[PDB]
Amino acid sequence: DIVLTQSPASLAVSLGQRATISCRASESVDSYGNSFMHWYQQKPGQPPKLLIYRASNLESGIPARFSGSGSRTDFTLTINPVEADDVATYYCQQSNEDPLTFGAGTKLELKRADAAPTVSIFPPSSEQLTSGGASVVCFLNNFYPKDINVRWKIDGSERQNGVLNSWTDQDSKDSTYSMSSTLTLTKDEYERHNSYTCEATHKTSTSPIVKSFNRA
């Protein structure tokens, strides 16, 4: 089979500058002088969107920012300049040989300005306590970069076990990220202690954003 190897698994570029994504094929994707390589743009919750067909042909409706070039085995997708709504995962695909194969994809993220997280701690729901469980949620909304740190503190202690995290995809408008840290415990252990803390260490501030509550 023909394997498609895409350069930059992920690429971070500033708004207003160009991006270059490569796609190398293990075998020629050419036939009859035409290159059967295709480029797609996939945003979260939506199916791939055709940007360029046959290496260099711009699909109608697609802004001129996008352009394609290459032949035989080496291909390139160029976004110039990169706009805020361009954040997505780009895939290359060959249709020269059966079976048709796709590249692993290249996630494009915008180098937006630094922004501190908006931490919000949420104690266990009364309804959840009836089930014998106790999850303390902590939302860290709108921040950049993606790399952040959450350290849970139960009665001053740094609880390491039972933390289920989840990051959202970079927002298409403000170019920020959001994170949810969840410390899951049993109701018995939850009632054993009193103070629950959710600390957020980020590059925007030396002092971590502490958010806690006294159980009552």
Place this chain on the structure above:
Amino acid sequence: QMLVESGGDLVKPGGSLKLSCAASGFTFSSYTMSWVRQTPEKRLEWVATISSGGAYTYYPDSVKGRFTISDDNAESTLYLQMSSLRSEDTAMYYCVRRAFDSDVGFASWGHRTLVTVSAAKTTAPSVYPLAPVCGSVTLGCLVKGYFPEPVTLTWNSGSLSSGVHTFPAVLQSDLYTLSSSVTVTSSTWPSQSITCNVAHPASSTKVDKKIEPR
């Protein structure tokens, strides 16, 4: 263009499942069609292709002999018969219009239908209202312990789209957990009703938890 695929469901390994795709707005009979899926790892994989008349069918070796792409040009519907299902078949199946005269790649995709191939049983989710230290106000919703995916979490029936961050479900040993934060103004809550809503199709669950202050 306008491809609505259906039939996605949780099936046991080695089982069978058939997918459908309603094509409307164009002359379906003249177009070559295809099925393309996307694994949980976000990997795009071509599944099958069938000619306008249905005489020519193409399938990758990992799918050939188990999957069968066919179509009904009378009612304009594309089909995908899946048999001897494997764990690797777990993916989002997109109905794609392949071509007419030229190879223009995959120009029109459907919104997809999720097919989950697992031995785990269907478990209904537990929706929990997340009042802040209820006392701009941020609120939250906890959908814990459910299988399989997905769930449709919405705020105020969709009328509340501002400041909503619905986080990706994380798998905690055969059971997913999804969260969502809605950030509104102090004059909007608890003054107005903000209802933490959820819906799980696999279990026929439809829970509406109202965010009540603490």
Place this chain on the structure above:
Amino acid sequence: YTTSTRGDLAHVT
């Protein structure tokens, strides 16, 4: 030709 003879559109005549 805008279609390949080794692909999934080889029937496309």
